[PDB]
Amino acid sequence: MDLILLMLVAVGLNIIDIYIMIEILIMGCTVNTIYSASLDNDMIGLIYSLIQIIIAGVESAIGLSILVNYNRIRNSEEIE
Amino acid sequence: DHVRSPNVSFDDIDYNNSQDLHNAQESLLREQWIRVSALKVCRKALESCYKTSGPNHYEDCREIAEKYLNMLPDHRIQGFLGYQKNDPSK
Amino acid sequence: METYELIDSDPKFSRVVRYFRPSDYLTWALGTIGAPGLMVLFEKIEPAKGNTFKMPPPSIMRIATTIGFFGGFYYAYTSSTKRFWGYSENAKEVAKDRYEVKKALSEKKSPYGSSLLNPYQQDMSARNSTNSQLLLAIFPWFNVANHQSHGIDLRKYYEVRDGEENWNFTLPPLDQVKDLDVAQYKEYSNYP
Amino acid sequence: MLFTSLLLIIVYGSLVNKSHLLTKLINRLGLIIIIYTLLIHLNINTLENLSIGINMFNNLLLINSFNNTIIELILIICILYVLLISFNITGLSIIDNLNYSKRTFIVIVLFNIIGLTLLPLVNDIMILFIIIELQSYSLYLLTAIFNESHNSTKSALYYFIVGSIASFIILDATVSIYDDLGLTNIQYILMYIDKLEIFDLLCLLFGLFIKIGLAPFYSYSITIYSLSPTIITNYISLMPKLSILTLIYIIMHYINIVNNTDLNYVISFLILISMFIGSFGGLNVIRIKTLLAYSSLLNVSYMLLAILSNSNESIIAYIYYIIQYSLTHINIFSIILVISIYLPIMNNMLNVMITKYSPIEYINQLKNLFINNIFIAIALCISIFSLIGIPPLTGFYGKYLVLISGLNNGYVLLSIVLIIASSISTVYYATILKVLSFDTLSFKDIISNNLIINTSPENNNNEIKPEISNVISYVISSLTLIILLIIIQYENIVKGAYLVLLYNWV
Amino acid sequence: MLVQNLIIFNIIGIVLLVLLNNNNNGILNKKSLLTIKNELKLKQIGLIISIINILIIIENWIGFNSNYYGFQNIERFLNIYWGIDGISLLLVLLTLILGPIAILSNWKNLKGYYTYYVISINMLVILMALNFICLDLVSFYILFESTLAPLFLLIGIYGANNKNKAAYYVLIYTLASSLFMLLSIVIYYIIINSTDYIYINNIILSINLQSLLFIGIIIGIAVKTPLMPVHTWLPTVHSESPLGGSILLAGVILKLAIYGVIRLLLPNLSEISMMFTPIIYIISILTLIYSSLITLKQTDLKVIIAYSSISHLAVCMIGIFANNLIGINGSLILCLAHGFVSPALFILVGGILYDRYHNRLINYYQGLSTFMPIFSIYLVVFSFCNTGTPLSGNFVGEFLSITGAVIRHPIIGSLTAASVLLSACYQMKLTNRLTGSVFSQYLHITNDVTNREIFLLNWLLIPTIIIGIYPSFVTNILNLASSTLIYSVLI
Amino acid sequence: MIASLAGWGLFGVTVRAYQQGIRKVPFSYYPLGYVYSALGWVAFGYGFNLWTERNDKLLEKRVEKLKESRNLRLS
Ligand SMILES: CCCCCCCCCCCC(=O)OC[C@H](COP(=O)(O)OCC[N+](C)(C)C)OC(=O)CCCCCCCCCCC
Ligand SMILES: CCCCCCCCCCCC(=O)OC[C@H](COP(=O)(O)OCC[N+](C)(C)C)OC(=O)CCCCCCCCCCC
Ligand SMILES: CCCCCCCCCCCC(=O)OC[C@H](COP(=O)(O)OCC[N+](C)(C)C)OC(=O)CCCCCCCCCCC
């Protein structure tokens, strides 16, 4: 089903909706790592997952900062 | 002065020795230029006879005419690439 | 390939500083005064604003000296390290190193020093700081721990070389040297 | 030395007062830091010892003579870039003061050099993801360093989204590898190089292919490069390829152990497609930076053929090409940052809006450079002639060496297409040379006083007043003669590349 | 000595000329002495360097031995081994001789920037001269392609109305094809690990791999010596390039492609050259017949001479692929004779008429033998030489090339004899029209040939008739060199 | 070996001479400039020859091993 690229129908029509899809996409990677690590009883996989959660947070903050300044750049008359 | 030809054959040398291989090519070139020089001499003998004989040129110049038409196909420059790169025995 | 004797695959930080040659201090001094000079040299090359030479403000010269103070030390630290690894001239250090170790084994103390770090922590520390000077141009990392993975065979400090027997040091068998792996696992095979 | 000095620059910059002279002086502090880094690096790191390959920091980082070559190259090219922001590129206060309006510019650049230099050394999938983010995050910030600009911010937003998807693909490949084997260290994975799905390493490459702008992903790179300020485009269009292409070469070195043909066909499909777009794309373009964006894609296509072939001659082809292409790229962009002083000024039709971010934006703004400055026009001509591949410049030896590596491994189809694609691309390199010179003899005697350079004040009227600053002129001249006169020392340089090893040994 | 003296002096000369002209640029307007008389001092220094280049080679011509087989004057400079043999020596002599003549032809007919033109002309001549004296395929290719950078700029800067089309033609035609010659050079470096001439002459390759390398190399050659159907660049470039660029592009650049056969095809790819020789004859005979017929319908004066260049070069390729000494010696003498007659015509057509009336259309010129008699004597004299009249050096080249063609292949090689008739059709029609009927009603009476333009003509005609009357000057150098190119095993 | 640094220095003179044209100044401007650009490249030229001589020593030793490996292959 997803070979027809169904996930494109599931992503909204705003720049903020793309940002969320990136997080939900990466969330799948971390859940996959936690799954393998627990079955193998391997904590190295859990170190990887902890890094992925922390790195996925820094990516969100930078992306939102760019989006925020993108928004105020239009609303930059400020001649009052 | 009159340099002597380095009489050398492709069949006795190693082509890895590019100094000797050069002589085998230079020796095969020089002998061929002799045959043309031999040929040009023989043709001169034919020309005197025909001019001197006149009507009898068919008789007094019989074997020279025969020999000249025999040496003509092979008394020409042929290079060395033919014999260097081919093996008649095989 | 210029190869010499491997004094220490992971030289300790305090050892590396104590082994600076006078020339190493010169490099540290040159690096310290080079960075403020390079700022001046650029201004002589090209003024920052305008068209005429203007001495940079003193505040820039103080931060420039600090930046060149670490850079000079880092260059000094890496050059001193090559000698330990054997990549450079280390005959002078080899005798100096051998004198300290032969003295150390003689007092039955460990050559490597006593350590707060347990067996796993000692070996883990060695992994981080071994060959860490290769990226010392990018970020700093020093061997500040008394571990035991130095890439040498302590047997080689028993044989006497030229000019050493005069030291008259007595070396006990390694089995009686305090704080060594060959002298710790006497009661249990997994506890030192 | 890099990391320690970065903290000092971070703190110091946040203390002193916001001014252009202090901002420009701090940029000259970073130029020292990068220089100091190179002296410490070259001191401890040697080709003769790093030949075997040395593990560092609990095997997370592995360094050998192939990686070590690029770290020094990256440091060198980062010196030539910082010279732009640290000195005058024109000397006209209006145009130049843009480079000094930002105090965190040099800090972010120093952040990236740490990111760039560590990426080729990675040896763990856990640190591969961390380092690739450190480099990726630094580029987005540098793209948006001029936060007032509408196009710059729009580009960083486009850059962040594409890179985020690119990083997710990279992260997902590593997770899949960990799922199969449970191992994170790359050396431990090599023990199971025959037991794992080799296409999961290809999914890793598909993420690194996005970040170098390879077709079909080329669309965003062309848009990004044609919107950022020319000083920014000069950095973000070259540096990522220096450190990612080195990483791609190593990953392909491990991949060719099992010599899977299906992997090579897909990559050949992308290399073949990219040459087509890299050549036919630039035929119909007006913006110079869009032109150099298509030019960049074509050269990356050539450099992948050397990577894809991956033999003993592929190290030589890649090591030489990546060096000459960087110097050519710096030389061309440095000239474009200078020749903006010869632009005319209105006293109309087509309403072309120019900004202080890209004063030179269109190819026909290079018009009559043969008249305004003949010496620098030839330098741009020599640089473009290298990109064309006219011998005996540096560019010819790059294509000649790449062809050897390509054909020696049986890539006949790609070798012919690259030679077709090179000739097609010569059309749009020739247009730059057509604009530079072809209308010289009609314009030879013209009354020109409306140039931007004619708004410079007259100092004395007795002393000689050079038109171009000192440092930028010396860099342009040096790299133009190195490009032109490589034939003199070519044999030594190539024999200096035979020694760069990646586990060849014996 | 040779190459080292030939490069170092020319580099010194180029630097000297640049220093003198660009000194006064500065920040102030300059009215110096070197600009006076249209850069006359700077043009003179350019003309002297062309004469001195000839003196360098003659210093080494004296040492040349005609009875030694093998490269002489071998030296290594820039990690490249150079050298001279019989064939290469004469082509070098032709290339440097056209140096002063190319510069002298453009003495006062450029709108400006004479220093740039003088530097480029001496640069192109040196690059082409050095192309005959290298000893590896890679260095051959380097010099074979480096001439594009000045030639493309020179034609674009100094060209005629369509200079942009002409510039875009020489750059792309001669690069998109010579890149195919790079592929076959690369493959030689992959299997043999060397591209040196001598090393690769002794190796035999598989007859499949011989066919690939030949196809690659002959693609790069069929464009430089324009063979149909890839000749479309030459007529366009000739009609638009500067007059000096036409003398080099016709005098020398075409002959680099015949020399390409001598080094790159016959010695090392000898077995596959025999196979392609029937095909080469088909392409060249059709080039000979079609180029002659196409010329009959042309209108531009300088195009008409351009196509006459293609017909002769087809005959040169016909002779050189004949496997005998007669064809090879004839082809090389024709290249030398065409190297003087072809530039002479462009002077007559694009250098004497075009500098007076500035129009190349044939319709405006007729009856020129009335008020320009000295022009019509040389046009008549050079018309005959261009068509193989027995006393010129072209007849010796064409007769031998035709003779060698029949020897190699009696049936189809005999069609080369159509060169004698067709060359007289388009050429004599052009001359008969120019110097016939009443003087044209569209032109105005002006000066006849000036003293400079007589000097150019006399010294392109004098070498032509010496080679015609006594061609053994060329032959005594060629014979031992040209005899190493023949492949035949007779038993 | 001085002649090798002589050539490198003369390349240093060319770059400063080529810098003058780009700046559009008389070629006699600031004669001390040619000394600095000359000495800069002699420093580079000095190091460059050290690097190439170092390459010769390394390449001779590597080829010693490569020749042996080929003989094992050619058995
Ligand atoms: C051991 C050898 C070291 C040599 C010196 C190196 C540092 C250069 C600084 C000299 C002092 C200076 O900058 O002097 C100033 C001069 C002249 O400047 P100008 O253009 O006339 O400006 C106008 C001057 N007014 C104000 C008088 C009008 O600048 C130069 O000529 C710079 C030369 C370029 C740097 C050469 C470095 C080559 C790098 C090669 C390695 C890859
Ligand atoms: C034997 C090989 C040696 C290497 C030569 C390298 C060329 C660099 C010369 C720079 C000198 C300069 O920029 O000077 C400019 C000079 C002379 O200009 P002008 O008419 O006097 O000035 C004009 C302005 N005025 C009159 C108002 C003052 O023109 C040249 O450049 C011509 C030669 C180079 C053109 C083609 C370059 C292609 C490079 C690639 C070749 C493979
Ligand atoms: C306006 C001007 C237009 C142009 C005019 C032409 C100028 C010619 C200058 C002559 C100089 C000369 O003679 O150089 C001679 C010197 C030293 O030669 P050597 O000691 O024998 O070294 C060995 C040389 N082999 C192999 C010939 C024997 O080599 C050089 O410095 C080389 C020039 C530098 C090229 C760039 C490579 C180095 C940087 C690497 C980064 C990729």
Author numbering:
A (entry chain K): 1 to 80
B (entry chain p): 3 to 92
C (entry chain O): 1 to 192
D (entry chain N): 1 to 347, 365 to 523
E (entry chain M): 1 to 491
F (entry chain d): 1 to 75
Text taken from the publication that reported this structure:
During analysis, it quickly became apparent that the sample was compositionally heterogeneous, with some particles lacking the FMN-containing flavoprotein subcomplex (NDUFV1 and NDUFV2, responsible for NADH oxidation) and some particles exhibiting an unexpected density that formed a bridge between the two major arms of the L-shaped enzyme. Our further analyses thus focus on states 1 and 3 (which both contain the flavoprotein subcomplex, with and without the bridge subunit, respectively) that refined to final resolutions of 2.8 and 3.3 Å, respectively. Therefore, we now refer to state 3 as the open state of Pp-CI. In the open state of Pp-CI, the Q10 site loops in the NDUFS2, NDUFS7, and ND1 subunits are ordered and in their closed-like conformations, and as a result, the Q10 site stays closed to the matrix even in the globally open state. The open state of Pp-CI observed here is an intermediate-level open state, with two elements in the membrane domain (TMH3ND6 in its π-bulge conformation and Tyr156ND1 flipped out of the E-channel) and the region of disorder observed in THM1–2ND3 (that facilitates NEM labeling) in open-type conformations but retaining the intact Tyr141ND1 trigonal junction (with Cys52ND3 and His107NDUFS2) and closed-like loops conformations around the Q10-binding site. Last, as also observed in twisted D. melanogaster and the Open1 state observed recently in mammalian CI, the Q10-binding site of open-state Pp-CI remains sealed to the matrix. Direct correlation of structural data with functional data showed that only the open state of isolated Pp-CI is sensitive to NEM treatment, consistent with a disordered section in the TMH1–2ND3 loop that carries C52ND3. In this way, the behavior of the Pp-CI closed and open states matches that of the biochemically defined “active” (closed) and “deactive” (open) resting states of mammalian CI.
Mitochondrial NADH [reduced form of NAD+ (nicotinamide adenine dinucleotide)]:ubiquinone oxidoreductase [complex I (CI)] is a large multisubunit enzyme located in the inner mitochondrial membrane where, together with the other electron transport chain complexes, it maintains the proton-motive force and the NADH/NAD+ redox balance that are required for adenosine 5′-triphosphate generation and a host of metabolic processes (1–3). The process catalyzed by CI comprises a redox reaction coupled to proton translocation across the inner mitochondrial membrane. In the hydrophilic domain, two electrons are passed from NADH to ubiquinone [typically ubiquinone-10 (Q10)] via a flavin mononucleotide (FMN) and an extended chain of iron-sulfur (FeS) clusters, forming ubiquinol, which is reoxidized to sustain the electron transport chain and reduce O2 to H2O. Here, we report the structure of isolated CI from the yeast Pichia pastoris (Pp-CI) and identify distinct closed and open states that resemble those of mammalian CI.
